[PDB]
Symmetry: C3
Subunit: 460 residues, 3 copies
Amino acid sequence: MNTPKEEFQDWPIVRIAAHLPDLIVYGHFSPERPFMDYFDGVLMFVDISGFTAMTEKFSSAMYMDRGAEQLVEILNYHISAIVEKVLIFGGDILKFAGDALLALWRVERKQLKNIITVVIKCSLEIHGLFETLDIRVKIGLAAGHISMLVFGDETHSHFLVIGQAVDDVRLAQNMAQMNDVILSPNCWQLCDRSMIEIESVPDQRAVKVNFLKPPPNFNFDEFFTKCTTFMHYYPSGEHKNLLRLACTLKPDPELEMSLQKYVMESILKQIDNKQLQGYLSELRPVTIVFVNLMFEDQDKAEEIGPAIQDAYMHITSVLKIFQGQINKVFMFDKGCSFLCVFGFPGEKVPDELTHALECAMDIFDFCSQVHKIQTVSIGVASGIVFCGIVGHTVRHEYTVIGQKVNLAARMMMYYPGIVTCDSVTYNGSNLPAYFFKELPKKVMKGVADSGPLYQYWGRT
Amino acid sequence: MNTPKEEFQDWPIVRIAAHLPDLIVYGHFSPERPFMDYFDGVLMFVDISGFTAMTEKFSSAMYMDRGAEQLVEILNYHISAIVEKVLIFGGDILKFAGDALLALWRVERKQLKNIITVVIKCSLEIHGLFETLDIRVKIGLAAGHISMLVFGDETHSHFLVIGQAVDDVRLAQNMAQMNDVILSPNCWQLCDRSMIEIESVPDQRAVKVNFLKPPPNFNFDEFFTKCTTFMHYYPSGEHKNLLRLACTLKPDPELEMSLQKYVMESILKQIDNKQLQGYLSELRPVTIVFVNLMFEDQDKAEEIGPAIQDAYMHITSVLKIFQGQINKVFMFDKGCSFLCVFGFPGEKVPDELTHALECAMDIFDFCSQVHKIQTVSIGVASGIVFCGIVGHTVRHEYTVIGQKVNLAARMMMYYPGIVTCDSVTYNGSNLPAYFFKELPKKVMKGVADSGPLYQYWGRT
Amino acid sequence: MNTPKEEFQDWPIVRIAAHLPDLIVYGHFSPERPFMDYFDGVLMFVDISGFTAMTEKFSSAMYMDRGAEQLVEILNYHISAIVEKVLIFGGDILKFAGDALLALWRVERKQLKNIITVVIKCSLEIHGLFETLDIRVKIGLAAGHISMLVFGDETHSHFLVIGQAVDDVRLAQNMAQMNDVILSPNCWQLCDRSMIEIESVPDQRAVKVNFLKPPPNFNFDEFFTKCTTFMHYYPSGEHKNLLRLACTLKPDPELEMSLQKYVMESILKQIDNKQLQGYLSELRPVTIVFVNLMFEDQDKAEEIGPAIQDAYMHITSVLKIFQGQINKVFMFDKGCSFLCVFGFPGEKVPDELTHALECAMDIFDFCSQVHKIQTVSIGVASGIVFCGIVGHTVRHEYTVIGQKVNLAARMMMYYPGIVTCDSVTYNGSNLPAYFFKELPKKVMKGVADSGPLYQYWGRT
Ligand SMILES: Nc1ncnc2c1ncn2[C@@H]1O[C@H](COP(=O)(O)CP(=O)(O)OP(=O)(O)O)[C@@H](O)[C@H]1O
Ligand SMILES: Nc1ncnc2c1ncn2[C@@H]1O[C@H](COP(=O)(O)CP(=O)(O)OP(=O)(O)O)[C@@H](O)[C@H]1O
Ligand SMILES: Nc1ncnc2c1ncn2[C@@H]1O[C@H](COP(=O)(O)CP(=O)(O)OP(=O)(O)O)[C@@H](O)[C@H]1O
Ligand SMILES: [Ca+2]
Ligand SMILES: [Ca+2]
Ligand SMILES: [Ca+2]
Ligand SMILES: [Cl-]
Ligand SMILES: [Cl-]
Ligand SMILES: [Cl-]
């Protein structure tokens, strides 16, 4: 009797799980919203610098209208290698945000110290990938308490991580110079100091890592193996040649119904072989509406949870009216941000700029009266941005990348408490001019020669 | 000199052969119509129960318009495993019909006894697959004389098996309770009784299998190996890691021209990479016209052959006028049935319900005067049904699944001699009401709360 | 720590390199136009005979409108095997032209003799493939000095080989009978005569190969291995199981920008997963405009280079005006030919026949006054031709095949110095009849019952 080879089956449920971390794929938690969970772990925030510039460049005539295709190709080539490292060292990639990504190693408190060592080593191997484009990487690491929030409605779900380790990992990464691995103070507080040579960082309790210098008889591979005891989903045994246990998921309608809610319809369409796999890679003009919500305490998940849910229910019904799409949600320095987009592929509408502004105002007014929301700020910018599926085959997400994405983000941060917009949006919208106010020019981190900015004042 | 690896070539001819059994693929017989052939073998009729219900359910709002995608996924996952078993135990899968399938082990008369043992074991291993959805399987087995009919015209070909083993395998399967393997009387008559523990079945000469209990020194794997001597196409040698010898077919225009006639144009389009692979998986409203032809002797292939051919030539020219499609042809309890469909993907027409009724009447009137056709009955029902490619990668077919498919089938059987229709077809058609007659409600096996049924009486 | 398997990555840059020889892929030369390079090597011109006939046949009703699909399938099946041989014996496939292909073994002068032996053996193994369709192969081999020309503009590039070895390899192949391997006189002059049994060829200095008869202790495999020392890109080591080193190319924007210019936009679209992979295989009516340019000395690359460039700049701006496309450029017996096509897939325009004629006249008049161009001849024919990607997965090109392609080629050769056209083009064009002159019928190699031919005289 033959024993023929089983071919890898690439079922829809497996294709969907590529878009989600194990935190969600194997999380099996209540379908009630908000849902909050609490655990400990180590975070790695890997930032690529140089891509919003390359993005601008690939618009130029030299790429012969294959700019989006070339950009996605070169981007994925690099990011794939970072994703392999993270996964092979046992991390869960939680989210992609432009050219950056956040990864988690979830463990019991007592194992934090050893895991931090695994993560530091992963970090240094990722720094190593780029001694070989004007691109390099900064890495922030944090460790401690983490909360998960799941929010949404009956057809769509989003998740977020929250808490002091989350805010820290961002702080850490923003202190880094090109090539630094920075540890949060709590990460440095909890780590095995006999292993790692650091240096101080100016007016900063965080630290920079210089070296991983392990004692005479330390064998990384045996240390790693001990560490895998604490890793629920590390591929092993018959499946040790796979990057992710999720590659072995089998059809299961209940599970697929749950997971599909995290993924955009147009992605699902491609997953279902009803749209060419290259239709979603595009350099196309869009409008980013970037919404920031600040709370008195952005680590109190039980407080901010209901608020984010309340805001999400409003934001989604307002966006629905204009094929606006929430592309990502995540904690910023201050607050929870919604990266919303008008004009993704297959979703254009006329008078997009006007609608973006009115939808922004509507969100601003509703969110400003939600209970625990202390301040709403919204940034609106329009231009050519890259849209596409970024990452590795086994772990990837739809993202947007562009100077306008960064500008909308910097506007909501540098002009808090109002709805602001760029010149492009101001000029192309069809609204009375006295609904705007022209603003003072602020010098904004990672932004040059933005034309005039405006506040969208609305009627009076 | 390198000896590089040859990649599996997935030529069109190989993709086409996935839709056909070895009986046709390697049959190389005359292109004249009808063609009849005569042989012996063992048949396995594997029925899944629970799928026309799941089908109804996947229409519900909870599947978020990915009902067809989820249904095909979960269905193929299960049916694939059954197809692997059948093929690995050396069977030829002849046909898929909804959620059921018919398999053949063709052998010389003197080998029937040993083969029946292989098939029983395959059966019990398939029962085993579902101790793990509200779905299970019934299996009927038969053995004896079998006839093949090939019929059609210059562009399309269909085949059918006919004879007492064919009628028996159906009888057997319809006696089964959930999980039974039933043997036909002749199968039980011919089998190695020292191997198998049976039990009697009420007012029935057939039997149920309880156990395969083989003598002290019986080694299944050596027994199987001896059995493969009689299996023409069992993959072996260099190709023992393949499920089907047909995976090694090479381009051959003469052969491809012949095989393509069995497959629907829209499938060929997908095979030719001219249509997305997911366009044919759909939950869509259609009209089933189910045509049953009864003969005085439904095992006399030389008699019924010319008649089925004569009917097919008419039916195809009438359907052609409305993009109606013959989806399958097969012997029922009584007679030869044509499962015809109006509104498959890419094939909708307006006033589909009207046309279905007029085409039915036309077929009824022509077929009723074909020489050896004793009775024509036609069932017409309309609703949401699943359309798609069901089975394994290496062996699959386009099929339809739905409560309306079963209803049209039960109508033609429970209201013989007339053209009948459902409420949906009655209400939506555009014909004078006095062309119909409202019928008595019959209680019909595997059917609840069908609204009123009607006879399509036609003009007078 | 796992070491998971890397999946073959099928990046766009690798898909693009399938369309190009290593000569271009790894050539890294100046982007200035014309560019000329000079080297030595051995050439193999492999011609298939029988395909323009099969092509005509696959138009017939028996193929049920899957003629293009069947033709490409059977063609690639055969041509793939020839491509594997050539690559495994270390050749660089330079170009496909209909059902023929040109291959190069580039080496230092001192290694010509040994390489010629490798190539002869490859040739005889390719002859061997077809003892098994009314198709066989003729092979011409040449050796000596070769020049490369690269020409084009900022968005498109073409290349050509030029010189006496190039003209010879064609002469040689045109002397061959079905199944002969013919060597050019210089090839025979340079080869290891102790190895090969030849015979004379009538009124011809070239020779036919009868046998490869190697001395007592000659071991082909060790001889081959020594020969690979001189082969820059022979896959080896970790990559010895690949047909081409180009399968390992990594994303590199600069390189991709350069390579993409050699490939048609519609191909790039399919490469980018923005068009179904089967859209470019078609039997479709087109118009071939075949342009031949003769120079006093068709081996003087430094002379003919600027001229071909000058002509190309004109030809491309004239074709652009009508979605006309240059499909291939190559040296003929006399001169440089441009195989231009009106009506490729996605590129039809109305009044195609008229435009073909006016574009031909325009090209004729401009090219006739380019400096070193001694004679321009243009052939115009219209009909059903096969369009598609021909070759192996790892090495393939878009080509056209048809009796009309050959006719346009024979017209420009047998009616030099004028623009000629066929009956189809004459009848369907919308021009005054007195712009044409009906010509004497010439008996033309590999052409029967072409209706009347005409000269396109133009206005007076
Ligand atoms: N797709 C995306 N998702 C989430 N945030 C994004 C984003 N694209 C841009 N941003 C926001 O834009 C802000 C500016 O980003 P930075 O991290 O300072 C740019 P960089 O990494 O130095 O170079 P880059 O712009 O080439 O990536 C970030 O704080 C980030 O939150
Ligand atoms: N695609 C298809 N091809 C052929 N016949 C079909 C069909 N779909 C339904 N039928 C017919 O419908 C009739 C009713 O089928 P049954 O076998 O009694 C249903 P079941 O298997 O108990 O549960 P199910 O409806 O979930 O499959 C059958 O006799 C069958 O011939
Ligand atoms: N796609 C293509 N590219 C370049 N030239 C082509 C071509 N198709 C036809 N031709 C030209 O047509 C001419 C006639 O070709 P031959 O080589 O004599 C035909 P053959 O090989 O005997 O049989 P065939 O027509 O079945 O291939 C050739 O000289 C060739 O240059
Ligand atoms: Ca960034
Ligand atoms: Ca069934
Ligand atoms: Ca040829
Ligand atoms: Cl997050
Ligand atoms: Cl059948
Ligand atoms: Cl060339």
